[PDB]
Design a protein around this motif. Structure first.
Motif, PDB file in Angstrom:
ATOM      1  N   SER C  95       0.778  -1.201   0.063  1.00 47.21           N
ATOM      2  CA  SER C  95      -0.086  -0.046   0.048  1.00 47.21           C
ATOM      3  C   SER C  95       1.009   1.406   0.001  1.00 47.21           C
ATOM      4  CB  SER C  95      -0.939   0.092   1.055  1.00 47.21           C
ATOM      5  OG  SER C  95      -0.223  -0.063   2.445  1.00 47.21           O
ATOM      6  N   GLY C  96       0.499   2.108  -0.944  1.00 43.10           N
ATOM      7  CA  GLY C  96       1.171   3.640  -0.874  1.00 43.10           C
ATOM      8  C   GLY C  96       0.829   4.247   0.266  1.00 43.10           C
ATOM      9  N   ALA C  97       1.651   5.552   0.400  1.00 42.86           N
ATOM     10  CA  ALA C  97       1.705   6.465   1.445  1.00 42.86           C
ATOM     11  C   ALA C  97       0.505   7.536   1.069  1.00 42.86           C
ATOM     12  CB  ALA C  97       2.819   7.063   1.903  1.00 42.86           C
ATOM     13  N   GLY C  98       0.082   7.414  -0.049  1.00 44.93           N
ATOM     14  CA  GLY C  98      -0.776   8.510  -0.664  1.00 44.93           C
ATOM     15  C   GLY C  98      -0.788  10.072  -0.086  1.00 44.93           C
ATOM     16  N   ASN C  99       0.696  10.451  -0.357  1.00 45.28           N
ATOM     17  CA  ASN C  99       1.081  11.730  -0.167  1.00 45.28           C
ATOM     18  C   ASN C  99       0.859  12.152   1.461  1.00 45.28           C
ATOM     19  OD1 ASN C  99       1.786  12.392  -2.731  1.00 45.28           O
ATOM     20  ND2 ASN C  99      -0.326  13.024  -3.143  1.00 45.28           N
ATOM     21  N   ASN C 100       0.834  11.214   2.201  1.00 51.58           N
ATOM     22  CA  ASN C 100       0.404  11.288   3.631  1.00 51.58           C
ATOM     23  C   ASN C 100       1.956  10.999   4.456  1.00 51.58           C
ATOM     24  OD1 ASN C 100      -0.311  11.077   6.396  1.00 51.58           O
ATOM     25  ND2 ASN C 100      -2.273  10.382   5.816  1.00 51.58           N
ATOM     26  N   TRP C 101       2.603  11.980   4.661  1.00 54.06           N
ATOM     27  CA  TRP C 101       3.781  11.842   5.587  1.00 54.06           C
ATOM     28  C   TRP C 101       3.659  11.062   6.697  1.00 54.06           C
ATOM     29  CZ3 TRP C 101       5.591  12.948  10.437  1.00 54.06           C
ATOM     30  CH2 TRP C 101       7.040  13.038  10.630  1.00 54.06           C
ATOM     31  N   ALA C 102       2.467  11.218   7.407  1.00 49.37           N
ATOM     32  CA  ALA C 102       2.482  10.086   8.762  1.00 49.37           C
ATOM     33  C   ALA C 102       2.510   8.792   8.213  1.00 49.37           C
ATOM     34  CB  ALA C 102       1.021  10.855   9.349  1.00 49.37           C
ATOM     35  N   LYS C 103       1.562   8.362   7.034  1.00 47.04           N
ATOM     36  CA  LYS C 103       1.628   7.089   6.752  1.00 47.04           C
ATOM     37  C   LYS C 103       3.154   6.575   6.449  1.00 47.04           C
ATOM     38  CE  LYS C 103      -2.814   6.461   4.757  1.00 47.04           C
ATOM     39  NZ  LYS C 103      -3.641   6.244   3.462  1.00 47.04           N
ATOM     40  N   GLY C 104       3.956   7.471   6.041  1.00 46.89           N
ATOM     41  CA  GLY C 104       5.307   7.041   5.772  1.00 46.89           C
ATOM     42  C   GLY C 104       6.375   7.130   7.004  1.00 46.89           C
ATOM     43  N   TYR C 106       4.978   6.923  10.410  1.00 45.56           N
ATOM     44  CA  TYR C 106       4.493   6.298  11.534  1.00 45.56           C
ATOM     45  C   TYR C 106       3.684   5.098  11.607  1.00 45.56           C
ATOM     46  CZ  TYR C 106       5.603  10.518  14.335  1.00 45.56           C
ATOM     47  OH  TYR C 106       6.254  11.539  14.773  1.00 45.56           O
ATOM     48  N   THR C 107       3.099   4.695  10.455  1.00 39.54           N
ATOM     49  CA  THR C 107       2.358   3.651  10.018  1.00 39.54           C
ATOM     50  C   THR C 107       2.888   2.705   9.157  1.00 39.54           C
ATOM     51  OG1 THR C 107       0.849   4.454   8.396  1.00 39.54           O
ATOM     52  CG2 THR C 107       0.382   4.987  10.869  1.00 39.54           C
ATOM     53  N   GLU C 108       2.426   2.579   8.099  1.00 39.39           N
ATOM     54  CA  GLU C 108       2.838   1.666   6.869  1.00 39.39           C
ATOM     55  C   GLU C 108       4.408   1.969   6.575  1.00 39.39           C
ATOM     56  OE1 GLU C 108       1.002   2.871   3.316  1.00 39.39           O
ATOM     57  OE2 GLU C 108      -1.115   2.620   4.250  1.00 39.39           O
ATOM     58  N   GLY C 109       4.972   3.049   6.841  1.00 41.80           N
ATOM     59  CA  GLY C 109       6.317   2.988   6.616  1.00 41.80           C
ATOM     60  C   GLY C 109       7.405   2.449   7.796  1.00 41.80           C
ATOM     61  N   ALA C 110       6.841   2.379   8.864  1.00 43.18           N
ATOM     62  CA  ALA C 110       7.437   1.760   9.960  1.00 43.18           C
ATOM     63  C   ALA C 110       7.433   0.544   9.999  1.00 43.18           C
ATOM     64  CB  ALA C 110       6.756   1.961  11.436  1.00 43.18           C
ATOM     65  N   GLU C 111       6.403  -0.285   9.371  1.00 46.86           N
ATOM     66  CA  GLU C 111       6.079  -1.919   9.117  1.00 46.86           C
ATOM     67  C   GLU C 111       7.564  -2.148   8.277  1.00 46.86           C
ATOM     68  OE1 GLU C 111       2.327  -3.125   7.792  1.00 46.86           O
ATOM     69  OE2 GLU C 111       1.396  -2.360   9.454  1.00 46.86           O
ATOM     70  N   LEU C 112       7.865  -1.363   7.286  1.00 51.41           N
ATOM     71  CA  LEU C 112       8.972  -1.977   6.219  1.00 51.41           C
ATOM     72  C   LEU C 112      10.190  -1.292   6.493  1.00 51.41           C
ATOM     73  CD1 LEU C 112       8.473  -3.252   3.324  1.00 51.41           C
ATOM     74  CD2 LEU C 112       8.730  -0.840   2.307  1.00 51.41           C
ATOM     75  N   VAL C 113      10.203  -0.316   7.445  1.00 52.32           N
ATOM     76  CA  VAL C 113      11.751   0.221   7.596  1.00 52.32           C
ATOM     77  C   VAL C 113      12.824  -0.899   8.001  1.00 52.32           C
ATOM     78  CG1 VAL C 113      11.428   0.950  10.039  1.00 52.32           C
ATOM     79  CG2 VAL C 113      12.901   2.327   8.584  1.00 52.32           C
ATOM     80  N   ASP C 114      12.480  -1.617   9.001  1.00 55.40           N
ATOM     81  CA  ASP C 114      13.309  -2.766   9.445  1.00 55.40           C
ATOM     82  C   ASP C 114      13.739  -3.670   8.406  1.00 55.40           C
ATOM     83  OD1 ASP C 114      13.654  -2.133  12.106  1.00 55.40           O
ATOM     84  OD2 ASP C 114      11.614  -2.568  12.638  1.00 55.40           O
ATOM     85  N   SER C 115      12.852  -3.839   7.425  1.00 54.04           N
ATOM     86  CA  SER C 115      13.359  -4.820   6.269  1.00 54.04           C
ATOM     87  C   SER C 115      14.340  -4.096   5.442  1.00 54.04           C
ATOM     88  CB  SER C 115      12.241  -4.843   5.402  1.00 54.04           C
ATOM     89  OG  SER C 115      11.107  -5.419   6.043  1.00 54.04           O
ATOM     90  N   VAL C 116      14.140  -2.860   5.513  1.00 52.27           N
ATOM     91  CA  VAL C 116      15.387  -1.794   4.746  1.00 52.27           C
ATOM     92  C   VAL C 116      16.711  -1.893   5.441  1.00 52.27           C
ATOM     93  CG1 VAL C 116      15.941   0.214   3.824  1.00 52.27           C
ATOM     94  CG2 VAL C 116      13.690  -0.602   3.515  1.00 52.27           C
ATOM     95  N   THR C 399      -3.598  13.183  11.883  1.00 48.69           N
ATOM     96  CA  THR C 399      -3.643  12.829  13.325  1.00 48.69           C
ATOM     97  C   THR C 399      -4.465  11.533  13.397  1.00 48.69           C
ATOM     98  OG1 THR C 399      -5.938  13.940  13.111  1.00 48.69           O
ATOM     99  CG2 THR C 399      -3.969  15.273  13.906  1.00 48.69           C
ATOM    100  N   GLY C 400      -5.461  11.118  12.352  1.00 52.74           N
ATOM    101  CA  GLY C 400      -5.787   9.955  12.462  1.00 52.74           C
ATOM    102  C   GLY C 400      -4.657   8.690  12.542  1.00 52.74           C
ATOM    103  N   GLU C 401      -3.469   9.085  11.902  1.00 52.77           N
ATOM    104  CA  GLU C 401      -2.354   8.121  11.845  1.00 52.77           C
ATOM    105  C   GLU C 401      -1.667   8.059  13.284  1.00 52.77           C
ATOM    106  OE1 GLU C 401      -4.012   6.734   9.707  1.00 52.77           O
ATOM    107  OE2 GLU C 401      -2.476   6.043   8.420  1.00 52.77           O
ATOM    108  N   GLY C 402      -2.191   8.813  14.157  1.00 51.01           N
ATOM    109  CA  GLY C 402      -1.260   8.852  15.315  1.00 51.01           C
ATOM    110  C   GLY C 402      -0.710  10.144  15.700  1.00 51.01           C
ATOM    111  N   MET C 403      -0.099  11.016  14.590  1.00 49.30           N
ATOM    112  CA  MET C 403       0.311  12.274  14.765  1.00 49.30           C
ATOM    113  C   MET C 403      -0.342  13.149  15.823  1.00 49.30           C
ATOM    114  SD  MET C 403       2.300  13.328  11.244  1.00 49.30           S
ATOM    115  CE  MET C 403       2.787  14.913  12.095  1.00 49.30           C
ATOM    116  N   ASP C 404       0.539  14.081  16.414  1.00 47.35           N
ATOM    117  CA  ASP C 404      -0.149  15.208  17.252  1.00 47.35           C
ATOM    118  C   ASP C 404      -0.342  16.417  16.724  1.00 47.35           C
ATOM    119  OD1 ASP C 404      -1.191  16.685  19.340  1.00 47.35           O
ATOM    120  OD2 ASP C 404      -0.350  15.165  20.790  1.00 47.35           O
ATOM    121  N   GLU C 405      -1.120  17.153  16.876  1.00 50.46           N
ATOM    122  CA  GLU C 405      -1.196  18.405  16.204  1.00 50.46           C
ATOM    123  C   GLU C 405       0.058  19.615  16.773  1.00 50.46           C
ATOM    124  OE1 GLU C 405      -4.860  20.758  16.669  1.00 50.46           O
ATOM    125  OE2 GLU C 405      -4.270  22.685  16.186  1.00 50.46           O
ATOM    126  N   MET C 406       0.538  18.944  17.987  1.00 48.87           N
ATOM    127  CA  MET C 406       1.600  19.802  18.497  1.00 48.87           C
ATOM    128  C   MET C 406       2.957  19.376  17.503  1.00 48.87           C
ATOM    129  SD  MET C 406       3.216  21.564  20.630  1.00 48.87           S
ATOM    130  CE  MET C 406       1.730  22.170  21.644  1.00 48.87           C
TER     131      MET C 406
END
Ligand SMILES: Nc1nc2c(ncn2[C@@H]2O[C@H](COP(=O)(O)OP(=O)(O)OP(=O)(O)O)[C@@H](O)[C@H]2O)c(=O)[nH]1
Ligand SMILES: Nc1nc2c(ncn2[C@@H]2O[C@H](COP(=O)(O)OP(=O)(O)O)[C@@H](O)[C@H]2O)c(=O)[nH]1
Ligand SMILES: COc1cc(CCc2nc3ccc(C)cc3s2)cc(OC)c1OC
Ligand SMILES: [Mg+2]
Ligand SMILES: [Mg+2]
Lengths: 437, 155, 431
Positions: C95-104, C106-116, C399-406
């Motif tokens: 699944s792509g990140a859909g221009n969503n920095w948070a997805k890349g 905090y969520t989908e990107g974190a699942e794949l990072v250790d493989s890299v 924010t839906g992906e966990g990020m905080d407005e702060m």
């Protein structure tokens, strides 16, 4: 014998070292493989040149030289050049990662990984001596290795060989032929931490060696090779008294006695003449008086400064070639009179004179013309404080904004060492100030 | 309560929900905490169909949330060209100012929506309007160095 | 300092990175199968920097291809040199990140990072003396922006004594698909100021203006832009890939170019500027190259150098020319622009020359500048970030992906500070 061990640190030191040892071999009749036909000695002997050359059982003369660098790229050319089988293989030490023009890497993080190997190798050469008298260290002020590691080496050598002398051949940085903006930092940093451990340091200003090659040798854009061959001519003049039976500067301790009145101001100014281009092979042969006077023309100095704006504290004249002493005394009396060169009121107002009746040697392949007589004037003058003034100004423009300081702090070094080194350099400028008037 | 269901339906684009929630009498001019009406939300997510529906059923084209943002501000910001015209066709205040002093021309300029800049200009967009910092739309094209935008803003 | 490990993330990272390999391979004599079919010998003296010598003469880029969208897999392999990469160095998700920095990040990107990281380790353990990494990515997306910075920060933890490089591409409404690109960029700049030693700013607004106005391309495509990117990435890596007298490495560049840790965003420039096809730019003299290098029209970052002060510069001349005519012309530009070089960093302009010219040209000059004027690029990204954030538009995606407005406001303040520091040293004087 009274042996000397030459140490070369960094790219500059190594390359200047390789040119000096190239020249030495020719001045002594040693082949690139060490075999000398005109020497009955086959195991050592006690000739004047044994101070710089060991001797195996097979008659091979191996320099008493160590070459150090934190990268291999430079020392790898020594291991494959014309002098492959000249130096001790174990005395060509290299690392994998250099100091990246950083004093703190060459002295702390990176330098620590190799320091103990260089000392053990030096100890190997030292243990093969019957009367070691000191070291000749060749290094630049700018590089990370030339400044950092060399400083680290001079500290350890003072602890291990406390009675022995230490002489430096330092390459004062020049912007025409530079490699890094942080060379002022490295220069001030090493000078402070080394000034305590060195007995006598001959600075070579790359800008001065650069100017000489463009006007006296007719070379548009000089290379590191042009500079080095010219530098090796001056160095050979200073080390000649140690390699040939002589009366002036016969051992390392005498350099201090004759040139260094006070420990801190141990930076004598070298001047060399004549420098004639090899393309002028049939030039008029200059006399003693013409080259003796040439040693006072500032265009022949190795460090750019004005000795007329400074008092002399010592002055040694080292002649080489067809030089009659009567012509030397006459030429000195001509200088003592017509010239307004002021000596400090507390030192002798005389000139020491050594004469080596061997004609100067030119490397086959260089740009220097064979001359029948040349001279090298070593002189400790307060005018060389100007060189410290130019460096101190650069280390001031940058440090005022703390530029590039983070690269040093992140390599195991305290910010306070910058203010320490600069205050120590400031303290050096006043030492020259008080000696003059 | 149908107010919320229409607000969240307009944001999502659920066109059919709009036709139904409104059938049961949902307040077309409902508001959320910040003051956003269904038309604000529809204009921010490029939902042209819901925009036109709400406008043909009593929506206030110039409504403002707590920050003074009119539906056109958001359309100009996010860059929905079609919605910028529909809003203007129904009497949108082309020079509405928000709490930060910005006008729809300001936001369209910052975001580089050059097509909407041209549209707002021909509809009376004030070029001397300043934000709280005194910057006009032209000032922004000069400070950021947007040669294309600076040319459009002087015709 | 010998080997460098190259990494590329996202559509943009793999596209410009794939072009980078097609360029240096052509210069070093490598073919899409690995066999060295070159004629000269300087093409191998420093081939270990980017390639791994396996099989016989089979060279393999020391590259790592990463992307959350699997559609980029077949794309790179469909390219010319697509077969030269090691097939195990492809680490692509579903699944792509859909221009969503948070997805890349905090969520989908974190699942794949250790493989890299496992791939990075294998590549790094096969190095004699690794000198650092270099990344190619865009700041306006989700994979290259979010998973890139996450991957960068994770590598900083694991290889803290190594140089971190990036070729970060900046978004621009002139070449843009979404208005959330300032969000993704600002959040990424916040990471690049703390976790990289050197960043080559490749601004898309500048690449567009060069094509649209200078090269007079009515409608620039990505291929036209990337023609400028690859040319810039080939010049800035010249001295890394050919010895010369400087024997340069990434660390020597950082020590001499980055006076202050946070201000490590270089403004690269190239000359001559040519499109894919033009052959009239094959006679530029040395004085033209020199002037044309400091010309704002030749910057790959949409910024005017005349509106600031150069902290440091690193010109690179390429081709058979007079090392003297260069040294005198470079000293000229340092006078007519004397007021554009900070007076408190003496001799802050280094000139190198390499005789190997790039493909298509006989002479070239590449510019690398640490100019305080780069704040213009950041104020532009910031003004756009602010405009969106003040309206709190599309925050729920993040924010839906966990990020905080702060976390948005922290990234905004950090860039405003970054622009402050540039302004400080732009107005500072020696006195
Ligand atoms: N005269 C002369 N100067 C040199 C030579 N090589 C380098 N230099 C000078 O040395 C200074 C830089 O120090 P280097 O010796 O090159 O660097 P290094 O000692 O290897 O230390 P690293 O930077 O860690 O590699 C510059 O100012 C150069 O001008 C040379 O062959 N002859
Ligand atoms: N120069 C150039 N820019 C690109 C390319 N692809 C995407 N971009 C830019 O990168 C941004 C989008 O990031 P992208 O790489 O597509 O996101 P990701 O693939 O999910 O990491 C936009 O601002 C584009 O203009 C390309 O091939 N070349
Ligand atoms: C990775 O690319 C390069 C690295 C270097 C590293 C060495 C440097 N030495 C100095 C000294 C002074 C100053 C002001 C800046 C620098 S940068 C040089 C380059 O081109 C000259 C490069 O471009 C290809
Ligand atoms: Mg070196
Ligand atoms: Mg070195």
């Amino acid at each position: 014998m009274r042996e000397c061990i030459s140490i070369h640190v960094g790219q500059a030191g190594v390359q200047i070292g390789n040119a000096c040892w190239e020249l030495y071999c020719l001045e002594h009749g040693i082949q690139p493989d060490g075999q000398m036909p005109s020497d009955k000695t086959i195991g050592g002997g006690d000739d004047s040149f044994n101070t710089f050359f060991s001797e195996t059982g097979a008659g091979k003369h191996v320099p008493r030289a160590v070459f150090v660098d934190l990268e291999p790229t430079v020392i790898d050319e020594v291991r494959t050049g014309t002098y492959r089988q000249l130096f001790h293989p174990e005395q060509l030490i290299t690392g994998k990662e250099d100091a990246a023009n950083n004093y703190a890497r060459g002295h702390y993080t990176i330098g620590k990984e190799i320091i103990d190997l260089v000392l053990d190798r030096i100890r190997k050469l030292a243990d093969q001596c019957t009367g070691l008298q000191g070291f000749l260290v060749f290094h630049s002020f700018g590089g990370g290795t030339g400044s950092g590691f060399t400083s680290l080496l001079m500290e350890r050598l003072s602890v291990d060989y406390g009675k022995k002398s230490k002489l430096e051949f330092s390459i004062y940085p020049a912007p025409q032929v530079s490699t890094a903006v942080v060379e002022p930092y490295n220069s001030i940093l090493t000078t402070h931490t080394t000034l305590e451990h060195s007995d006598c340091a001959f600075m070579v200003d790359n800008e001065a060696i650069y100017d000489i090659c463009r006007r006296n040798l007719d070379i548009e854009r000089p290379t590191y090779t042009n500079l080095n061959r010219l530098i090796s001519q001056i160095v050979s003049s200073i080390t000649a008294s140690l390699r040939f039976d002589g009366a002036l500067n016969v051992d390392l301790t005498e350099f201090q006695t004759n040139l260094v009145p006070y420990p801190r101001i141990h930076f004598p100014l070298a001047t060399y003449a004549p420098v004639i281009s090899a393309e002028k092979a049939y030039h008029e042969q200059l006399s003693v008086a013409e080259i003796t006077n040439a040693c006072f023309e500032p265009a022949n100095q190795m460090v750019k400064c004005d000795p007329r704006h400074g008092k002399y504290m010592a002055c040694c004249l080292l002649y080489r070639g067809d030089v009659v002493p009567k012509d030397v005394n006459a030429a000195i009396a001509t200088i003592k009179t017509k010239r307004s060169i002021q000596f400090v009121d507390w030192c002798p107002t005389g000139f020491k004179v050594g004469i080596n009746y061997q004609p100067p040697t030119v490397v086959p392949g260089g740009d220097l013309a064979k001359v029948q007589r040349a001279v090298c004037m070593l002189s400790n003058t307060t005018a060389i404080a100007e060189a410290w003034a130019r460096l101190d100004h650069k280390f001031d423009l940058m440090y005022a904004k703390r530029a590039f300081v983070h690269w040093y702090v992140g390599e195991g070094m305290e910010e306070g060492e910058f203010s320490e080194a600069r205050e120590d350099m400031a303290a050096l400028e006043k030492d020259y100030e008080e000696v003059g008037v | 309560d149908l107010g919320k269901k229409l607000l969240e339906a307009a944001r999502a684009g659920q066109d059919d929900e709009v036709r139904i929630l409104m059938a049961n009498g949902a307040d077309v001019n409902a508001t959320d905490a910040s003051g956003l009406t269904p038309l604000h939300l529809a204009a921010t997510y490029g939902h042209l169909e819901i925009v036109e529906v709400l406008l043909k059923h009593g929506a206030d084209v110039n409504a403002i949330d707590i920050m003074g943002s009119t539906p056109l501000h958001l359309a100009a910001l996010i860059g929905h060209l079609e919605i910028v015209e529909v809003l203007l066709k129904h009497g949108a205040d082309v020079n509405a100012v928000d709490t930060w002093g910005d006008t729809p021309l300001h936001l369209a300029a910052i975001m580089g929506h050059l097509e909407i800049v041209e549209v707002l200009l021909k509809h009376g967009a004030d070029v001397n309007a300043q934000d709280k910092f005194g910057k006009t739309a032209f000032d922004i094209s000069i400070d950021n160095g947007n040669e294309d935008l600076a040319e459009i803003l002087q015709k | 300092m010998r080997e460098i490990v190259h990494i590329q993330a996202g559509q943009c990272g793999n596209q410009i990175g794939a072009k980078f390999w097609e360029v240096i391979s052509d210069e070093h004599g490598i073919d899409p199968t690995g066999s060295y079919h070159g004629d000269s010998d300087l093409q191998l003296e420093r081939i270990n920097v980017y390639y791994n010598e396996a099989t016989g003469n089979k060279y393999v880029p020391r590259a790592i291809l990463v992307d959350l969208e699997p559609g980029t897999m077949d794309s790179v392999r469909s390219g010319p040199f697509g077969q030269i990469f090691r097939p195990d160095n492809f680490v692509f998700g579903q699944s792509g990140a859909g221009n969503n920095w948070a997805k890349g990040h905090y969520t989908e990107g974190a699942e794949l990072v250790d493989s890299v990281l496992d791939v990075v380790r294998k590549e790094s353990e096969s190095c004699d003396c690794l000198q650092g990494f270099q990344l190619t990515h865009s700041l306006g997306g989700g994979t290259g922006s979010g998973m890139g910075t996450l991957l960068i920060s994770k590598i900083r933890e694991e290889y803290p004594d190594r140089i971190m490089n990036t070729f970060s591409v900046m978004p621009s409404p002139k070449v843009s698909d979404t208005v959330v690109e300032p969000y993704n960029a600002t959040l990424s700049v916040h990471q690049l100021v703390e976790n990289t030693d050197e960043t080559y700013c490749i601004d898309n607004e500048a690449l567009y203006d060069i094509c649209f106005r200078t090269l007079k391309l009515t409608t620039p495509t990505y291929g036209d832009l990337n023609h400028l990117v690859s040319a810039t990435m080939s010049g800035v890596t010249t001295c890394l890939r050919f010895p010369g007298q400087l024997n340069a490495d990434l660390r020597k560049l950082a020590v001499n170019m980055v006076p202050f840790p946070r201000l490590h965003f270089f403004m690269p420039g190239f000359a001559p500027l040519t499109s894919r096809g033009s052959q009239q730019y094959r006679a530029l003299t040395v004085p033209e190259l020199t002037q044309q290098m400091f010309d704002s029209k030749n910057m790959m970052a949409a910024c005017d150098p005349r509106h600031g002060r150069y902290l440091t510069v690193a010109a690179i001349f390429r081709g058979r020319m007079s090392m003297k005519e260069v040294d005198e012309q470079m000293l000229n530009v340092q006078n007519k622009n004397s007021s554009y070089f900070v007076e408190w960093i003496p001799n802050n302009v280094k000139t190198a020359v390499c005789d190997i010219p790039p493909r298509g040209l006989k002479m070239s000059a590449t510019f690398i500048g640490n100019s305080t004027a780069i704040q213009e690029l950041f104020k532009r990204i910031s003004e756009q970030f602010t405009a969106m954030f003040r309206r709190k538009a599309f925050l729920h995606w993040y924010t839906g992906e966990g990020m905080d407005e702060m976390e948005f406001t922290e990234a905004e303040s950090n860039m405003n500070d970054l622009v402050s520091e540039y302004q400080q040293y732009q107005d500072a004087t020696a006195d």
